[PDB]
Amino acid sequence: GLGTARLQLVEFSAFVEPRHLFVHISQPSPGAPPLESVDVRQIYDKFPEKKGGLRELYDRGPPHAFFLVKFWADLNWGPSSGGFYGVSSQYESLEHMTLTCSSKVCSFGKQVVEKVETERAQLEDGRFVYRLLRSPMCEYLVNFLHKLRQLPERYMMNSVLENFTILQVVTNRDTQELLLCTAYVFEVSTSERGAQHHIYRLVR
C-alpha cells in the first residue's frame, strides 16, 4: 500500500494519552485492488509552490514514491486538558539506511511548521525497522487540536480542516534520494464509525 520496494510504512498513528488515536494506519490483503490514483496537479495548491513544494518534488521523482492519504480523524476524546500528544511511525526495509523524515504542516498552502527527524536502521527479524515512536506533537498541532475539538458541529471541523495539510518527505540521508513522499488531507469521522483512511497513488 504505502511503500516502495526500498521503504514500506508499517504503522502510523497520532494519539493522546492521559490512549486515543486521532488517526491510525496499520500495515496484507487477498483480492485487494491496486491503489486508485489522483492527479498530483489537483493538489499543488494545498502545499506551497516554493522549494520543497509538491511540484518541484515530483519533478525530481521518482514518481512511484508519491502517495496521498485522506484521513477521517477521530477527535472525540475526554471524560480533558494536558495529556501526552504523540506521533508514532514505523517503516521497514531490506537495505540498511539512515533516514531523514521531514514533516511540513501547512495552513492555506503555507508552511507553518517543519519538523525534521533522523532514524537509523535497527535489525529485527531479518529486516531493518525504523521506529520513530512517541515523538511529541509540536505545540502548534496540540493547540490546533484543542481548539478544533471545541467546535460544535462536524461540518464546521471539516470546513476548518479543508485548509490544513501535511507533507512528509522521507529521504536516504546518505545519498539524499527521495524514498517516500506523502501528502495528507483531513476530515473528521464520528466516534461511532471511528478513524479511517484512504491511500492513493499520486500520478502525473
Ligand X SMILES: *C(=O)CCCCCCCCCCCCC
Binding site for ligand X (CB under 6 A): 14, 22-23, 73, 87, 103, 115, 137-138, 141, 166, 186
> Would you say 179 and 168 are in contact if contact means Cβ atoms under 8 Å apart?
no
Angle 11-17-23 from CA coordinates, rounded to 5° = 35
Q: How far is the CB of 34 from ligand X (least distance, A)?
A: 26
Q: How far is the CB of 100 from ligand X (least distance, A)?
A: 14
Q: How far is the CB of 94 from ligand X (least distance, A)?
A: 26
CB closer to ligand X, 12 vs 200: 12
CB closer to ligand X, 138 vs 203: 138
CB closer to ligand X, 196 vs 203: 196
DSSP character string of 48-100: -SSTT-HHHHHHHS-GGGEEEEEEEE----------EEEEEEEEEESS--EEE
> Would you say 37 and 203 are in contact if contact means Cβ atoms under 8 Å apart?
yes
CB closer to ligand X, 175 vs 191: 191
Q: How far is the CB of 13 from ligand X (least distance, A)?
A: 9
Query: CA gyration radius for the chain?
Result: 17
Any residues with CB less than 8 A from the CB of 61 and at least 6 apart, and which? 178
CB closer to ligand X, 87 vs 178: 87
Name the nearest CA neighbour of 179 among 114, 122, 95, 123. 95
What is d(CA 131, CA 128) in angstroms, rounded to the nearest whole number?
A: 10
Q: How far is the CB of 118 from ligand X (least distance, A)?
A: 14
Cell of 94: 531490506
